[PDB]
Scaffold this active site. Sequence first.
Site, short mmCIF file in Angstrom:
data_model
loop_
_atom_site.label_atom_id
_atom_site.label_comp_id
_atom_site.label_asym_id
_atom_site.label_seq_id
_atom_site.Cartn_x
_atom_site.Cartn_y
_atom_site.Cartn_z
N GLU A 109 5.05 38.58 33.41
CA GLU A 109 4.52 38.92 32.09
C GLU A 109 4.49 40.42 31.82
OE1 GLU A 109 2.09 38.35 29.06
OE2 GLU A 109 4.05 37.38 28.84
N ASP A 112 4.68 33.25 33.91
CA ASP A 112 3.92 34.49 33.87
C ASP A 112 3.76 35.13 35.25
OD1 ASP A 112 3.62 34.13 31.11
OD2 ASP A 112 1.75 32.99 31.38
MN LIG Z 1 1.40 32.20 29.23
MN LIG Z 2 4.28 35.07 29.04
#
Ligand SMILES: [Mn+2]
Ligand SMILES: [Mn+2]
Length: 181
Positions: A65, A93
């Site tokens: 992320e 993520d």
């Molecule tokens: Mn997410």
């Molecule tokens: Mn994301």
Amino acid sequence: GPLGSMEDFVRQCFNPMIVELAEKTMKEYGEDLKIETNKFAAICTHLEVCFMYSDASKHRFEIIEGRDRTMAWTVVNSICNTTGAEKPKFLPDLYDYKENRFIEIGVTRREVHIYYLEKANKIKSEKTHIHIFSFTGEEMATKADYTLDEESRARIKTRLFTIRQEMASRGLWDSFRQSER
Ligand SMILES: [Mn+2]
Ligand SMILES: [Mn+2]
């Protein structure tokens, strides 16, 4: 009973790096953070939660992320070439090095099982672990496996709690909560 500006709140209770990553995130889609201000805060929040999630155990997670798609996919591809794992169709993520799997973190202003199920239907791959948080202390994770211990997740949920009530004191919380779908 004054009503505040979401943008100001976002620039006042979030770290400048977080805010920059949010701005970059929205720009990469061309979205204006002046039409979508609740989305701005949602992204800052999600970002922070992912980062705190990784900070809970240093040297355990890889962060995907906040990266460029090219670079994030480069990291995912590297990890999967090292392990032979299936390249997920969607960018997750995090990557758990200990359980050797990808993690999708979700944060919702709605019921957590709904968000969890929508994520589960959306991401296709049953190999990506899912962890959902709410702003009310509720969380929902795959196979009742919560990865982190209680204190760390309580730390996260406390931060979320703070965000929500600091929103409330400015009158931002109702619209923010309503905005989700
Ligand atoms: Mn997410
Ligand atoms: Mn994301």
